[PDB]
């Protein structure tokens, strides 16, 4: 039975030998098929992105990128809250998880954030988070 | 919503 939990477990499975597009797309499709979907999606994603296992984090970031590239006010708005953004910031800041996270994972997050400031100007907290990151010297 | 994280 494919809930968001099962789908994300499949889409970010450390054992995947290559990106599992069927599962990644299925997660994005399934998350809007419910009022409470978007917040659950985002809580699950935030935890996977923080994994010490890189390939797990990297796959989770691909899911997030993929879902964000598609239309959907609710999901876009959830990711656009500090409640989610704070989870991404912890990954890139030396005060939190940054000193133990690969540059691959960190830079992917910073580029994703930038892309959303350009593609989704209405999500003003995304831009605020990114401006903080520049002032604090994360974004070089 | 939460406050923006302090880093």
UniProtKB/Swiss-Prot annotation, chain A:
Q: In which tissues is it expressed?
A: Ubiquitously expressed.
Q: Which residues cross the membrane?
A: none
Q: What subcellular compartments does it reside in?
A: Golgi apparatus, trans-Golgi network membrane; Endosome membrane; Early endosome membrane
The organism's place on the tree of life at top rank: Eukaryota
PTM field: Phosphorylated by CK2 and dephosphorylated by PP2A. Phosphorylation of GGA1 allows the internal DXXLL motif to bind the VHS domain and to inhibit the recognition of cargo signals.
Domain VHS per the UniProt entry, residue ranges: 11-140
The record comments on the domains as follows: The VHS domain functions as a recognition module for sorting signals composed of an acidic cluster followed by two leucines (DXXLL motif).
Give the similarity note. Belongs to the GGA protein family.
Q: What does this protein do?
A: Plays a role in protein sorting and trafficking between the trans-Golgi network (TGN) and endosomes. Mediates the ARF-dependent recruitment of clathrin to the TGN and binds ubiquitinated proteins and membrane cargo molecules with a cytosolic acidic cluster-dileucine (DXXLL) motif. Mediates export of the GPCR receptor ADRA2B to the cell surface. Required for targeting PKD1:PKD2 complex from the trans-Golgi network to the cilium membrane. Regulates retrograde transport of proteins such as phosphorylated form of BACE1 from endosomes to the trans-Golgi network.
Q: How does this polypeptide assemble, per the annotation?
A: Monomer. Interacts with GGA2 and GGA3. Binds to clathrin and activated ARFs, including ARF1, ARF5 and ARF6. Interacts with RABEP1. Interacts with RABGEF1. Interacts with the type-I membrane proteins LRP3, M6PR/CD-MPR and IGF2R/CI-MPR. Interacts (via N-terminal VHS domain) with SORL1/sorLA and SORT1 (via C-terminal cytosolic domain). Interacts with EPN4. Interacts with CCDC91. Interacts with HEATR5B/p200a. Interacts with SYNRG/gamma-synergin. Interacts (via GAE doamin) with NECAP1 and NECAP2. Interacts (via GAE domain) with AFTPH/aftiphilin. Interacts with TSG101 and UBC. Interacts with RNF11.
What's the name of the protein?
Answer: ADP-ribosylation factor-binding protein GGA1
What organism is recorded for this protein?
Answer: Homo sapiens
> From the entire protein, which fragment is shown?
7 to 146 of 639
Curated annotation (Swiss-Prot), chain B:
PTM section of the record: Palmitoylated. Undergoes cysteine S-palmitoylation which promotes interaction with the retromer cargo-selective complex which mediates its retrograde trafficking to the Golgi apparatus.
Per the record, the domain of life is Eukaryota
Q: Where in the cell is it found?
A: Golgi apparatus membrane; Endosome membrane
Function summary: Mediates the transport of phosphorylated lysosomal enzymes from the Golgi complex and the cell surface to lysosomes. Lysosomal enzymes bearing phosphomannosyl residues bind specifically to mannose-6-phosphate receptors in the Golgi apparatus and the resulting receptor-ligand complex is transported to an acidic prelysosomal compartment where the low pH mediates the dissociation of the complex. The receptor is then recycled back to the Golgi for another round of trafficking through its binding to the retromer. This receptor also binds IGF2.
Record text on subunit structure and interactions: Binds HA-I and HA-II plasma membrane adapters. Interacts with DPP4; the interaction is direct. Binds GGA1, GGA2 and GGA3. Interacts with the heterotrimeric retromer cargo-selective complex (CSC), formed by VPS26 (VPS26A or VPS26B), VPS29 and VPS35; which is involved in retrograde trafficking of the receptor from endosomes to the Golgi apparatus.
Domain comment (free text): Contains 15 repeating units of approximately 147 AA harboring four disulfide bonds each. The most highly conserved region within the repeat consists of a stretch of 13 AA that contains cysteines at both ends.
Family per UniProt? Belongs to the MRL1/IGF2R family.
Its protein name is: Cation-independent mannose-6-phosphate receptor
Whose protein is this, by species? Homo sapiens
Full-sequence range covered: 2485 to 2491 of 2491
